[PDB]
Amino acid sequence: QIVERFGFSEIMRSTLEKDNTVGTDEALLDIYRKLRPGEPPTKESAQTL
């Protein structure tokens, strides 16, 4: 659904490809560990904040 919305530009096709991690429960923990470091990352502790 991301490629469907941002497909008309080549600068967004280069973003999802250069991306490091994929997954709904994966990039949600990636945000948790950079925002509140030092805490255990739970799929539902990042879904909450």
């Binding site: 509140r36 470091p37 030092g38 805490e39 255990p40």
Partner: protein, 86 residues
């Protein structure tokens, strides 16, 4: 034996990883000084290491015992010595 004393240190290192960083943000709002919150965290977990009753029951919330110990330390720090000078 010697491996039994090392299990006590591996037990403390566990509660650090789940509660210390969350307890730090609690003391930070109560005091406002980040360097003071670290002082509250070390004193709180030091009393956890001295109270085996709080580390005994995992079926009882141990995180909450910390937030009230931190509350009592900050309200005691909030007495006479801080009153005049701060």
């Amino acid at each position: 034996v010697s491996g039994a004393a090392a299990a006590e240190a591996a037990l403390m290192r566990a509660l650090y990883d789940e509660h210390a960083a969350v307890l730090w943000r609690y003391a930070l709002r109560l005091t406002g000084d980040a360097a003071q919150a670290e002082d509250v965290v070390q004193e709180t977990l030091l009393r956890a290491w001295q109270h085996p009753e709080v580390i005994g029951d995992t079926a009882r919330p141990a995180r909450a015992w910390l937030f009230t110990v931190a509350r009592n330390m900050i309200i005691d720090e909030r007495r006479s010595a801080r009153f005049r000078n701060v």
